[PDB]
Structure 1
Amino acid sequence: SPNSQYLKTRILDIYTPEQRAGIEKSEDWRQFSRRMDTHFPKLMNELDSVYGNNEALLPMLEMLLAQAWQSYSQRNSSLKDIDIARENNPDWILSNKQVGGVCYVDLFAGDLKGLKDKIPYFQELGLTYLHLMPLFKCPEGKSDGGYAVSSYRDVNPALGTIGDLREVIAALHEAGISAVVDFIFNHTSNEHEWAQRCAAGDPLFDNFYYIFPDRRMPDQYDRTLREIFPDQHPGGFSQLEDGRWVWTTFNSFQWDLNYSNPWVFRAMAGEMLFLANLGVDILRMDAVAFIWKQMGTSCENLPQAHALIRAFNAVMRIAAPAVFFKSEAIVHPDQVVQYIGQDECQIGYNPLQMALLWNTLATREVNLLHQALTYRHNLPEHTAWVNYVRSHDDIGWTFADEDAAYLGISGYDHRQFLNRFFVNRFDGSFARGVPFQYNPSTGDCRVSGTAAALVGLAQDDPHAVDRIKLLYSIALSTGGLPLIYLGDEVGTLNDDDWSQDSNKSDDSRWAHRPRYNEALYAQRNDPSTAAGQIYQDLRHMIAVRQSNPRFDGGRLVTFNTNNKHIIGYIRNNALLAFGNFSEYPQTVTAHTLQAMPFKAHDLIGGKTVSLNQDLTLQPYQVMWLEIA
């Protein structure tokens, strides 16, 4: 394979003799050259592992690297400073100081300019990380909430212009907040120019997607394909006007990109560089599990999918060091963690913890949660979990059947219980969620609904507020970067019109995608309201997390509480956390605490607690005891 020095010389051949001389002496080239030598080996290796001796590999690479240089040269000086800072501080993502939030620009603040006006509030809340949902042009009507991209560069006019976005990013950086956007690279909308030209037979866009003449291949593939939206279509394919079939893992209007074609990688790498130069700090790698297909397999988590992502990682290491990745892999735990690594995705959603928080609220038993915190929490160096309570999506019960089997729990039977409980089809359930994608052929089902809707706030369950606080307390202190679903900090309930909207009625996820609730936000300072109680609660926990070094890092050690309703863990051997998932008082005996100091200050309630005697926690109470 060619080497870094070889490719760099060729990159400089576009400059006349006089220019070439100057370029080689410039700071930009110096840094670019150094990073090329350091990271090119990985890029080449990962790409080769996927394409092999593909004739297009070499040509695609030189073209991509030429862009990488141009992209780095044009990169703004301020961004280059962030590039240097993060190069030498790979663990910035692990700082206890980081706290993120996520919202739809349109639902939360109208448009881009409006979002800019909400920045003061984000600072007031303590955010240092902000994820904005899909901002670029997409089909009018149904676009899977913007996840069906028709243009990676043209901002949805309803939100503003590319200029407004560029402005928002700079304002976020000014307020000490990182910009986080989606990198929907597994597929585009069926209205995207690429799709159009590919299907129309433009030789330039040949093999940019997976299109079949009939059901021969589709049927073979469907034998092992999981259905994500069985409500929309069976298997993973959709039929075109002309009768052909296109691979559509998600909605029919979302066509999977064909990474078996190296020119497809180059295309998306180009888009990443575009997003990088806008000043994006973290790219949410959407559906990383499906970017590689292979007949007979599930076409999820394949080796080449990981390799491609590590290739993308390399491009950023060379042309935009500040850009980190956030893996969205809502799959089996064993698979989830494989996307997380310094050379792949530095951080990734922690669906296991999230799903188990809700599970524990239902069963009142921390068994599965404790198991996960004990065996699946700690990660490799320079990587972190993104811990969350809810997201724009439904809740999938992605705990491991094998893990559950160890505890004498039948995964299938357990999920059936969980699903019933959270959609209020179980006696006594406090949850008011809505079903999502009930698959009659598999028994699988997911749950939609806001955090407040699932804890019982819609009916004013007296335990609703403390439940919210408890869940967020755990995502905030286990170790990793905590993500707040904006709207949750004031107990925002479900949207009560989505079912009436013909563009949303067939997607219950819109039930937990409500608009900014002016009334609730106007009560965040009133301790007598649910909004105020939830707000000050979370704000206080955020404040503590960010100021107390004992929460730093992502490592944790579980503590056996000897009480099936109480979870316990220790951060940095100095912070002991207890969490009662019972609606009744529960005790951690003096005998269980013998190894703990006689007294410890609780950062949650502010009181001094004695650990030389039984410790009784009130319903849903959380304690952050300083033991060192």
Structure 2
Amino acid sequence: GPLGSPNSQYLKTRILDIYTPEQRAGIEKSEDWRQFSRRMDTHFPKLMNELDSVYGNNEALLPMLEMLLAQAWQSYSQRNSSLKDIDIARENNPDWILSNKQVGGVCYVDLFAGDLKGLKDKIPYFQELGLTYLHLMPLFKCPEGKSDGGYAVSSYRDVNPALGTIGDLREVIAALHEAGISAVVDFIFNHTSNEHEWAQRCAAGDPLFDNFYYIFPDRRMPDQYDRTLREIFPDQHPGGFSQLEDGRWVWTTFNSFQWDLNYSNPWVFRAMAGEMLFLANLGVDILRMDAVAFIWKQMGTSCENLPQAHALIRAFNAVMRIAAPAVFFKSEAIVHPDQVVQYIGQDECQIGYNPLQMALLWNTLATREVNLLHQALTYRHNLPEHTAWVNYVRSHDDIGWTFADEDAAYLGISGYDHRQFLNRFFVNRFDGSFARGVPFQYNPSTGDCRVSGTAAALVGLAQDDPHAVDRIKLLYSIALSTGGLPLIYLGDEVGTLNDDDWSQDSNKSDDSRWAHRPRYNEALYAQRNDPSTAAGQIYQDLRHMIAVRQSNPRFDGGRLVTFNTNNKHIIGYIRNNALLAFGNFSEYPQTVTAHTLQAMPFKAHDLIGGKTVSLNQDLTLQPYQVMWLEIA
């Protein structure tokens, strides 16, 4: 703007006004201030541009921003020197996320290890597995009873006391860092629980919390909005709103006890940015940006993926570039693939879940046909510089069939009919199916349904299907080798089956996702080194692929080129022009012809099986065989 308007230099002089002139002189000369000052200059114009694009000439914008930047300085000043070293290192190495060295795991602290002290005791296991990244499921205070598995947050600062204290969390994070492991946690920034102090105060009409949520007097606007809102948990409530005891209606995209925060209020942004800086200074390395798609609402639209949602995330990003450069964002957007990828950017979310690949791994097991998977790896895999996918096989959530109908239509596939088939297959309602999953949120108004169940349940391990172990290794091979940071759902690496206690526990019984949230299975973990057990076969074969990925630089980076196998059952792709991966999605042997392989060297070492493979004749793969062939 013109002479007189706000800019980094203006804002910095006002930050320093809290100091006596004597104190100020010292602050300005300090190392912390020089670093803060240079990052302000570099990144503040982005923060201002993004916020201006959202809030425009809102009276509260300048006061809120000065408040937030004063907080950003106090936060960076307090930030521990070991974390400032990580800041400098990541500032100098934006592609750390793209290294083949990275392998992630995720677990619930309570289910996997009891409590935070118990989790700290599991760290030698994480090292034995090879993890360099560990996502811990929501850790903070939440409603007793039903809390959407911790996702209805009653406090961003107080640890759930069943898990331990903030001090225990601090020690865990430092212990993870000592072991070479990044700490990853959720930033549940779209909504709080209805017991959160802000929600109570907002609903009670406390002016300090005016417009922190979206509360309406009656159904007039909810009915209007509901004309275009998708139902995420239709078993819980219709549309996007829930009714308070006093008769008013509040926006609740998810459960009725999760109230969507009102980002059209710039004081909400500032509030959440303060919570973000608190997590940063715990030493968190990556924040999982929960429900990114939903943070802006607009009548007559889906209220998903709106331009302002992307702008607010880029504003949050610039706050981290200024006050905690180590802290990266992981986008969790389970939406149309055209929209998934728009969250991924060095200035937005540097990494994002890849639900397209994950959904299509499962699809290809069901159909035995790699067509959709091949299409996605050909046209939707490669990303902008300085960004990466998080490739995964399962998560704490159901599987949604989030492939693009337009893509499927190019292949002669009707998306609607195909999902009906996938849904039947994976819940064991299709002749011959190996899968033992359970439905989640069947919606009779749309035909939509998703699938619950662990990786091992969905491949046939519960019934001892002789192909189950090999199916698990095949799916993980692809997440481990396509390019991106792979994420193991801990428990999968020993073949953990569903919890069949869940259906009868009245705090869980309306949420079939609890089927694939079992506790740590001591008996299976105890078999992990025994090659005659399914646990041992799964664990040693995953561990072997992790060792290869992490040691072999032909896996480095996020880029791939697909290779046409000329066999509809076999997927093929090349990393770094040097590693040729084939995966057979058929339960029968399948061949890649000598003719298809003419451009390849006569012989190549297979890193999976350890044998030299001849490529100048027909290559027959065993049912569900993976080969990782060194061609350069």
Scaled to the shorter chain, the TM-score interval is over 0.9
1:500 corresponds to:
504
Deviations 1:340-385 (A, max 9, x none): 0000000000000000000000000000000000000000000000
Quote the offset at 1:449 in angstroms: 0.1
Q: Structure 1 CA distance, aligned partners of 2:269 and 2:420?
A: 40
Which of 556, 560, 573 does residue 577 from structure 2 map onto?
573
User: In structure 1, what is the Cα distance between the partners aligned to 2:577 and 2:470?
Assistant: 26
Q: What does the per-residue CA deviation read over 1:235-260, in whole Å, with 9 as the maximum and x for residues that have no partner?
A: 00000010000000000000000000
Taking the aligned partners of 1:496 and 1:294, their CA distance within structure 2 comes to: 41
Report the Cα distance in structure 2 between the residues aligned to 1:35 and 1:201, rounded to whole angstroms.
Answer: 39
Tell me by how many angstroms 1:45 deviates. 0.1
Distance 1:474 1:150 in 2: 38
Distance across 2 between alignment mates of 1:69 and 1:495: 47
Q: What whole-Å deviation, never above 9, does each CA across 1:537-593 have from its counterpart, x for those lacking one?
A: 000000000000000000000000000000000000000000000000000000000
Separation of aligned partners in 2, 1:510 and 1:317: 37
Whole-angstrom distance in 2 between the partners of 1:598 and 1:504: 56
1:519 and 1:246 map into 2 onto residues whose CA distance is 46
Of 201, 218, 241, 2:245 maps to 241
Structure 2 counterpart SS, 1:275: helix
Give a deviation string over 1:48-103, Cα, whole Å, max 9, x none: 00000000000000000000000000000000000000000000000000000000
The whole-number CA distance in structure 2 between the counterparts of 1:19 and 1:578 is 64
Q: Which residue of the partner structure matches residue 290 of structure 1?
A: 294
Shift of 1:211: 0.1
Residues 152-207 of structure 1 deviation map (CA, whole Å, 9 limit, x = unaligned): 00000000000000000000000000000000000000000000000000000000
CA deviation after TM superposition for structure 1 residue 150, in Å? 0.1
Moved over 3 A (4+): none
Give the total of aligned pairs.
628
Say yes or no: does 1:82 pair with 2:86.
yes
Alpha-carbon shift at residue 496 of structure 1 (Å): 1.1
Give the CA deviation at 1:46: 0.1
Q: What are the Cα deviations for residues 502-543 of structure 1, in whole angstroms up to 9, with x where unaligned?
A: 000000000000000000000000000000000000000000
Q: Distance in 1 between matches of 2:79 and 2:314?
A: 22
Q: CA RMSD in A?
A: 0.2
Cα distance in 1 between the residues matched to 2:344 and 2:542: 28
Q: Tell me how far apart the structure 2 counterparts of residues 603 and 129 of structure 1 sit (CA, whole Å).
A: 24
Partners of 2:85 and 2:254 lie apart in 1 by: 39
Spell out, residue by residue over 1:316-349, the C-alpha distance to the aligned partner (whole angstroms, 9 max, x if none). Answer: 0000000000000000000000000000000000
In structure 2, the residue corresponding to 1:591 is in which secondary structure?
coil
Matched residues in 1 for 2:140 and 2:24: separation? 37
- TM-superposed CA distance for 1:117, in Å, is 0.0
Q: Distance in 2 between matches of 1:496 and 1:204?
A: 46
Mapped pair 1:50 → 2:44: no
Q: Whole-Å Cα distance in 2 between the matches of residues 456 and 236 of structure 1?
A: 37
Q: CA deviation at 1:627?
A: 0.1
- Partner Cα distance (1:399, 1:608) in 2: 37
Per the alignment, residue 350 of structure 1 pairs with 354
**Residues 420-440 of structure 1: per-residue CA shift (max 9 Å, x gap):** 000000000000000000000
Q: C-alpha distance in 2, partners of 1:104/1:627? A: 40
Q: 1:2 & 1:252 partners in 2: Cα distance?
A: 41
Query: Which digits, 9 at most, give the CA deviation of each residue in 1:249-301, with x for residues without a partner?
Result: 00000000000000000000000000000000000000000000000000000
**2:97 corresponds to which residue?**
93
Q: Distance in 2 between matches of 1:231 and 1:174?
A: 44
Which residue is equivalent to 1:318?
322
Q: Secondary structure at the match of 2:595?
A: helix
- Equivalents in 1 of 2:240, 2:532: separation in Å? 50
CA distance in 2, matches of 1:27, 1:120: 36
Distance 1:48 1:434 in 2: 46
Distance 2:525 2:476 in 1: 18
- Deviations 1:78-136, CA, capped at 9 Å, x for gaps: 00000000000000000000000000000000000000000000000000000000000
Question: How far apart, CA to CA, are the structure 2 residues paired with 1:220 and 1:88?
Answer: 49
Question: How far, CA to CA, are the matches of 2:55 and 2:463 in structure 1?
Answer: 56
Mapped to 1, the partners of 2:393 and 2:6 lie a distance apart of: 47
**2-structure distance, mates of 1:483, 1:23:** 42
Q: Work out which of the residue numbers 545, 551, 568 in structure 1 matches 2:549.
A: 545
- CA–CA distance in 2 between the matches of 1:125 and 1:203? 51
Q: Secondary structure at the match of 1:440?
A: coil
CA distance in 2, matches of 1:461, 1:236: 42
Provide structure 2 residue ranges, at least 5 long, that are not aligned to the other structure.
none
TM-score by length of 1: 1.00
Partner Cα separation in structure 2 for residue 619 and residue 508 of structure 1: 31
Kindly indicate whether residue 423 of structure 2 is the aligned counterpart of residue 419 of structure 1.
Answer: yes
Alignment of 1:611-626 (within 5 A): 611-626=615-630
| Alpha-carbon distance in structure 2 between the residues aligned to 1:62 and 1:604 | 56
1:362 paired with 2:366, answer yes
2: CA distance between counterparts of 1:500 and 1:231?
17
